[PDB]
Design a protein around this ligand. Sequence first.
Ligand SMILES: c1cc(NC[C@H]2CCCO2)ccn1
Length: 185
Amino acid sequence: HHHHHHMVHITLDRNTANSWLIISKDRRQVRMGDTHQNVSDNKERFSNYPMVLGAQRFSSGKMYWEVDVTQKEAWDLGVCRDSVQRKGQFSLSPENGFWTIWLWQDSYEAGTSPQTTLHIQVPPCQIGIFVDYEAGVVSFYNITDHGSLIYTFSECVFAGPLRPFFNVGFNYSGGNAAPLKLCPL
Ligand SMILES: c1cc(NC[C@H]2CCCO2)ccn1
């Protein structure tokens, strides 16, 4: 792809994080802690899942960023509306304000409703995410496989400002402790 020149510097918003997440000093990495991280509760925190938002809000233009997922067994990545539900149970779908892909149990899927199987020959270690606000497009790229296309959501109805979206996943297995990292430009 040729989206690299739309690169944006994303940082994580601590205030939105589930209370078990640990965000690095530079706000560029996030991982699952083994306990509550001793923060107060607030209406912005995702309560039920190990999720966090980027601080940046997008309402126009073209934006691109990359995320490192090396050695993880489970994660969700993409964008979401600023006004998505934070508390309780919900599914990741465009109807609920999410445009996402994930890894779960050795398969990759797009967060449509119902979910769509992805066809990935080279398991990615870094994911590229492209948003074209005006066109209503969210695309995902396999950086490990020379930028090959993973998935495109088109005809998106964003219906609000967008924020970068992250889920580090649970670590019931002991094999999913590794962080998500925002990769340098
Ligand atoms: C199972 C459930 C846990 N709940 C506390 C936090 C983590 C994400 C959702 O809320 C923590 C660890 N194992």
